[PDB]
Design a protein around this nucleic acid. Structure first.
Ligand SMILES: Cc1cn([C@H]2C[C@H](O)[C@@H](COP(=O)(O)OP(=O)(O)[C@@](F)(Cl)P(=O)(O)O)O2)c(=O)[nH]c1=O
Ligand SMILES: [Mg+2]
Ligand code: NA
Ligand code: NA
Ligand code: NA
Length: 326
DNA sequence: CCGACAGCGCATCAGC
DNA sequence: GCTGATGCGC
DNA sequence: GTCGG
């Protein structure tokens, strides 16, 4: 974090535009600028120097000049004093409350943690569980706990059916020393792009993890994506571990490499890589890479035998997961 | 100048 | 109930 | 908010 003050400023601007202004493109522009500045290997000395990077334009360069000269940004100092903006920003920190619900609650006089606590009947199920674990979901997960969680998930999945493969993705797979949640990619030979020979493939795993009291709550659940809450077991007289977010994604087994590329991220890396694919005339999702015809219509899926094959198609040198943390 | 900005699963609601 | 739009979060 | 054409 040679440039942590600047990237913090840009992230706070991004959050303002997303949560308060509901200007999703300004939000993505600011996160793109923070990302490229975060990886720039020199302490930025001027907005001019920063404007040389792709994604920093005239407006952000001027903000950086103000921040360098004074250590702050008047625009943000004013946002911080504004009650409505501060209230809306805070409410979106609850899982399942986004910009729209945050403004609806604030318009109703529901502005603080206790207001939510006293109006639990105005929350949907996701939001209710988000509020329940508000503190826990602020806490990062040390990699050592991620390794215990992996061992549980892998062993419990193996007990349901030895032909499942579970892969922990997200920031853990990129080598991070701490993660915000646990992302699990799941495959089974019964579920391919050709057929689903077995029902309840995801449910079976979730059920086993609930049985052993690892999964404690559900945020949403369908046939291929589970989002919920889990907890490591603690020892006698030991304080309990925080509850943790867990996402499980069941992907057709023959589409594993597109799925593991997607679920490894980062999100910004995925955005960069998918944008580059579009420029090269391909489209990449978590299932396939397909060519784009002269009309923009996605073609037929291309053969994929490794993560590197996806990079080769779009003429990118291969990047290890540890180098995808944008 | 200005069109595009990655891609999608699940929850919820509205219109029928 | 279906279908399509919107919210939210990977 | 930024950028390619
Ligand atoms: C949020 C998001 C995620 N993804 C992919 C890429 C992420 O790496 C993967 C997991 O989503 P997370 O939000 O858990 O991201 P993460 O990289 O694991 C993380 F670093 Cl933000 P954390 O460790 O906090 O979960 O889903 C996207 O493609 N687009 C997205 O908008
Ligand atoms: Mg994650
Ligand atoms: Na630039
Ligand atoms: Na939220
Ligand atoms: Na996640």
């Amino acid at each position: 974090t040679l440039n942590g003050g600047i990237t913090d400023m840009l992230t706070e601007l991004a959050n303002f535009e997303k949560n308060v202004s509901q200007a999703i493109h300004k939000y993505n522009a600011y996160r793109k600028a923070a990302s490229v500045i975060a990886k720039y290997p020199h302490k930025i000395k001027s907005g001019a120097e920063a404007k040389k990077l792709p994604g920093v334009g005239t407006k952000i360069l001027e903000k950086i000049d103000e921040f360098l000269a004074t250590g702050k940004l008047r625009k943000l100092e004013k946002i911080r004093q504004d009650d409505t903006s501060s209230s809306i920003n805070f409410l979106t920190r609850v899982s399942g409350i986004g910009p729209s619900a945050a403004r609806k609650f604030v318009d109703e006089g529901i502005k603080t943690l206790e207001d939510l606590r006293k109006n639990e009947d105005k929350l949907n199920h996701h939001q209710r569980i988000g509020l329940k674990y508000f503190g826990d979901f602020e806490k990062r997960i040390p990699r050592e706990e991620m390794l215990q969680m992996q061992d549980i998930v892998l062993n419990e999945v193996k007990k349901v059916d030895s032909e499942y493969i579970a892969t922990v993705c997200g920031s853990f797979r990129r080598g991070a020393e701490s993660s915000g949640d646990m992302d699990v990619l799941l495959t089974h030979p019964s579920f391919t792009s050709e057929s689903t020979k077995q029902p309840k493939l995801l449910h079976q795993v979730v059920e086993q993890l609930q049985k052993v009291h690892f999964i404690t709550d559900t945020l949403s659940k369908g046939e291929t994506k589970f989002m919920g809450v889990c907890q490591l077991p603690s020892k006698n007289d030991e304080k309990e571990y925080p509850h943790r977010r867990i996402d499980i994604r069941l992907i057709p087994k023959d589409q594993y490499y597109c799925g593991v590329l997607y679920f490894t991220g980062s999100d910004i890396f995925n955005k960069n890589m998918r944008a580059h694919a579009l420029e090269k005339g391909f489209t990449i999702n978590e299932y396939t890479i397909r060519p784009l015809g002269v009309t923009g219509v996605a073609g037929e899926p291309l053969p994929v035998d490794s993560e590197k094959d996806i990079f080769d198609y779009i003429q990118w040198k291969y990047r290890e997961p540890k180098d995808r943390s944008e």
